[PDB]
Swiss-Prot record, chain B:
Residues 1-35 are annotated as: Heptad repeat 1. This is Spike protein S2'. Changing S47A: In strain: Alpha/B.1.1.7. The chain holds residues 936 to 1033 of 1273 of the full protein. Changing L46F: In strain: Omicron/BA.1. It comes from the Viruses. Subunit of the fusion protein that is processed upon entry into the host cell. Mediates fusion of the virion and cellular membranes by functioning as a class I viral fusion protein. Contains a viral fusion peptide that is unmasked after S2 cleavage. This cleavage can occur at the cell membrane by host TMPRSS2 or during endocytosis by host CSTL. In either case, this triggers an extensive and irreversible conformational change that leads to fusion of the viral envelope with the cellular cytoplasmic membrane, releasing viral genomic RNA into the host cell cytoplasm.
Length: 49, 98
């Protein structure tokens, strides 16, 4: 992973975002979601990610 | 001749129509406001947030739309009292002049 002063941004477009895969890395210390509830992320379309 | 030519002759009846039609445009254009919520559409708030957090954003819409309705009704009661004043004057002229 890059340093905080050179953070790496990855474009995500034209795909299917199955967010259930996110919990493969189970030990999550923080999962704060702003604007969107983490349970409803599988029923929304996003312009750009 | 003084009514088919002069355009602002029936300016008292047309002004009554304008005020009531202008208050409805403002009432229905207040549905696009957010009043602090993340969106002005209840479907967006319901389909993006959990029920514990949706009630927080929704209550901002309700208290803002509820205050938009009270402003419309209160000014409608005030305006309907001007009309009844002119309706009582026209009923007096109809029975005394006519
Ligand atoms: C940064 O992200 C891009 C786009 O995902 C990726 O191709 C690249 O390997 C990443 N670079 C580093 C140094 O992590």
């Amino acid at each position: 992973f890059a340093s905080v002063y050179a953070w790496n941004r990855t474009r995500i477009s034209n795909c299917v975002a199955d967010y259930s895969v996110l919990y493969n890395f189970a030990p999550f210390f923080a999962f704060k979601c702003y604007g969107v509830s983490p349970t409803k992320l599988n029923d929304l379309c996003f312009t750009n990610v | 001749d003084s009514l088919f030519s002069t355009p602002s002759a029936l300016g008292k009846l047309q002004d009554v129509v304008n005020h009531n039609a202008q208050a409805l445009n403002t009432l229905v254009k207040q549905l696009s406001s957010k009043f602090g919520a993340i969106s002005s559409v209840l479907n967006d708030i319901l389909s993006r947030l959990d029920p514990p957090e949706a009630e927080v954003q929704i209550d901002r819409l309700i208290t803002g739309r509820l205050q938009s309705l009270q402003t419309y009704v209160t000014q409608q009661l005030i305006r309907a009292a001007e009309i009844r004043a002119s309706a009582n004057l026209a009923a007096t002229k109809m029975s005394e002049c006519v």
